[PDB]
């Protein structure tokens, strides 16, 4: 079907903030951009 | 290939085309200005050559 690629245009050009995640865009391979990782440390079996 | 072998082989105006967004600009047609040379190398698909 000729309108394949037209479709993913508008998908990879969207970028969609104001959501429950907040500033979803993909990347040129399609991937999250702009996470967050929690740093963590084991202190006596314990995480903090 | 070329570094290993006496005959002078020599390449220059190495080109590469974005048929990825397809906008239908003359980028292609702009970076082909600057081209010279008798042979010229090609690495398409059937639909899109």
Same mark, same amino acid.
């Given at each position: 079907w000729k309108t394949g690629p037209l479709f993913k245009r508008v998908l990879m050009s969207?970028?969609?903030?104001?959501?429950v995640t907040g500033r979803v865009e993909f990347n040129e391979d399609g991937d999250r951009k702009f996470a967050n990782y929690s740093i963590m440390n084991l202190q006596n079996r314990k995480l903090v | 290939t070329i570094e290993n072998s006496f005959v002078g082989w020599e390449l220059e105006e190495v080109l590469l085309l974005d048929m990825?967004? /397809? /906008?239908? /600009?003359s980028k292609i047609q702009n970076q082909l200005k600057k081209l010279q040379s008798p042979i010229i190398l090609l690495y398409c698909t059937k639909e899109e050559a």
């Open positions: 969207s970028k969609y903030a104001d959501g | 990825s967004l /397809d /906008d239908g /600009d």
